[PDB]
Amino acid sequence: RPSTPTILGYEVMEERAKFTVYKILVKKTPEESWVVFRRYTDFSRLNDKLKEMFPGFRLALPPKRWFKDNYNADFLEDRQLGLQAFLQNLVAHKDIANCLAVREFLCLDDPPGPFDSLEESRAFCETLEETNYRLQKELLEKQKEMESLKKLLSEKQLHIDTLENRIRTLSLE
Amino acid sequence: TPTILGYEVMEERAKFTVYKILVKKTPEEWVVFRRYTDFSRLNDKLKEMFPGFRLALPPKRFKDNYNADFLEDRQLGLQAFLQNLVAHKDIANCLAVREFLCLDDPPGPFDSLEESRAFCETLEETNYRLQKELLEKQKEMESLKKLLSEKQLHIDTLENRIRTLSLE
């Protein structure tokens, strides 16, 4: 039942390719509080696990941008408001707010404190690189299932050819 | 036949591999830099437009990313790959191929990295494409699952029919 996670701000970081992280204030007890830094991608993956584990519940993430400026000020602030709404709705549900993946997302178990937070985010956050890697892996696995299916389809088809032979043969005899 | 000079690890706070490629068609004529990733993507497009022709090198990976031995084997595979690109007339004149080597309207020898950043697809776009593919292939797979159910039904029908004729 954690007090409303509140997004404090965002900051655009630079690896010579920019990415945005969100400063999320998290409060457990009105006295002690800590901050975690999360990329949009992370909110995404979370919501994905939520759609799986809670199929009877849908939560809202603001849209993706593949094309229009990602680092636009109006857009980024919009994106933020949307993320805080996402969080409020995230804790307002009882099963969800205590969900395992949620507790990991907010570090409600072993919070970093200051100075530990960039470390934790660096370990946790999936980069676009790693995300794309995952996507390739899935693409391959789905290729596997698809071939398995096509083969299987071929087999059933062969059985059908056989049965038709058996039918045409018996009809004339 | 354009010939590769060497390899270099370039970096914008994420490590990536570029290949410094000399490009000439019947020499007495420039330099282009190309990521492995473009060779790969191009190879995918080749597998699209030229389905009955497969060219060289299969995947890289989960292991040490920079391995000098692996580096040279990969490069040899790449010059062979270029060799295969020029060996078929159609491949050599394929749109994606002539655009790839800057064969349409080449920049000349000083413009190398500029064109390189301009050409390579950004990580955002790569990710968009990949998502699209994943969705398409799930659609296909679902249609397929359906098809298999249909075929199953047909088999049930025919078995019933043979049992029928059996007694008659």
Curated annotation (Swiss-Prot), chain A:
Changing residue 40 to A: Abolishes binding to phosphatidylinositol 3-phosphate. One of its GO terms (biological process) is receptor recycling. GO terms for cellular component: early endosome; early endosome membrane; endosome membrane; intracellular membrane-bounded organelle; late endosome; late endosome membrane; lysosome. GO terms for molecular function: identical protein binding; phosphatidylinositol binding. Residues 118-173 form a coiled coil. The keyword Protein transport applies. It is found in: Early endosome membrane; Late endosome membrane; Cytoplasm; Lysosome. Homooligomer. Interacts with EGFR. May be involved in several stages of intracellular trafficking. Plays a role in protein transport from early to late endosomes. Plays a role in protein transport to the lysosome. Promotes degradation of EGFR after EGF signaling. Plays a role in intracellular transport of vesicular stomatitis virus nucleocapsids from the endosome to the cytoplasm. This is Sorting nexin-16. It comes from Homo sapiens.
